[PDB]
Design a binder for this molecule. Structure first.
Ligand SMILES: OC[C@H]1O[C@@H](O[C@H]2[C@H](O)[C@@H](O)[C@H](O)O[C@@H]2CO)[C@H](O)[C@@H](O)[C@@H]1O
Ligand code: BGC
Length: 296
């Protein structure tokens, strides 16, 4: 692998993304704002060299939701290695639904979708998921995570609508609260015509070449999640992928599972909570040390 795109930091970093302002596709109680508004609301910026991207934790919400940002990269990649080093990620905050993921070109889910970092509410473990068109199942081996669903098809017969094929990390510091308590870590995602692999290196355990110019995933520890096998035409299920950063609220996942999890005691429903308790979302922010993409 050789470097092809270093996102840098601060404004140079944001220059490489488009700010999504449309209604939330996942129907969350969120108000995605433009770059200027976000900048004017302290939603984006730099923090001691780290790139900051958060949500409104000051004002009571109104309109379509609590303000946040959803960044989608201008550049796209189809084969390569995506390495993100985070000092902080949106916390395990009730009502929130953060995600660092990739989305293919064309109509979803035909171009494929890779959720590298995702979770909802007070989740402890991270979920790594693939969302694809029909005809793509993965094998159960080659990774340290716990396999939940093996059919990547968004409307797979035996799984919840759009659960996709998901693998749950076993390290409680792989997401939100625990992740932030150790100062974060690194998530490396490899896309090849033979499958996808995702490695999570908690702060201090990353290999010597992961942040360098010529990383070689071949000599690394077993990945946390691996999607491969003859049950999928890996090449055809995924096309050029663009990177996406976002934090939504409630909606199809977080909002739907609000009443059965540990947040049910915060309020009758997710929206009421997110609307009236701004101070609860102070931890809902990303803090990027670096974002680099490589190619074979
Ligand atoms: O992971 C199990 C969980 O899946 C939920 O569907 C989510 C999916 O997990 C997520 O990766 C994707 O981005 O959004 C879909 C739709 O919200 C499902 O709603 C849950 O019931 C299920 O427990
Ligand atoms: O934003 C990417 C896609 O995400 C999916 O979860 C939504 O259902 C689609 O409508 C949307 O196009």
């Amino acid at each position: 692998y050789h470097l092809v795109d270093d996102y840098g930091r601060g404004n140079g970093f944001f220059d490489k993304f488009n700010f999504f302002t449309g209604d939330d596709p996942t129907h969350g109680y969120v108000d995605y704002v433009s770059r200027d508004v976000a900048a004017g609301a302290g939603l984006i910026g730099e923090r001691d060299g780290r790139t900051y991207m958060g949500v409104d934790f000051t004002n009571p919400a109104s309109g379509r939701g609590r303000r946040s940002v959803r960044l989608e990269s201008k550049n796209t990649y189809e084969h390569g290695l995506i390495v993100i080093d985070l000092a902080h990620m949106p916390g395990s905050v009730c009502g929130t639904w953060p995600a660092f993921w990739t989305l293919g070109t064309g109509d979803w889910p035909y171009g494929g979708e890779i959720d590298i970092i995702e979770g909802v509410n007070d989740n402890t473990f991270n979920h790594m998921v693939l969302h694809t068109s029909d005809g793509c199942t993965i094998d159960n081996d080659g990774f340290t995570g716990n396999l939940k669903t093996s059919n990547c098809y968004v409307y797979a017969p035996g799984q919840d609508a759009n659960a996709g094929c998901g693998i749950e990390a076993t390290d409680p510091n792989s997401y939100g609260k625990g992740f932030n308590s150790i100062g974060g870590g690194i998530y490396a995602t490899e896309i090849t015509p033979n499958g996808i692999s995702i490695w999570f290196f908690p702060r201090g355990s990353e290999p010597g070449d992961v942040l360098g110019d010529n990383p070689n995933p071949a000599n690394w520890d077993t990945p946390a999640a691996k999607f491969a096998g003859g049950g999928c035409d890996w090449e055809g299920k995924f096309n050029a992928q663009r990177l996406i950063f976002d934090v939504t609220f409630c909606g199809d996942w977080a909002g739907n599972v609000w009443g059965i999890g540990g947040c049910a005691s915060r309020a009758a429903n997710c929206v009421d909570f997110v609307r009236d308790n701004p101070s609860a979302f102070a931890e809902s922010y990303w803090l990027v040390n670096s974002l680099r993409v490589y190619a074979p």
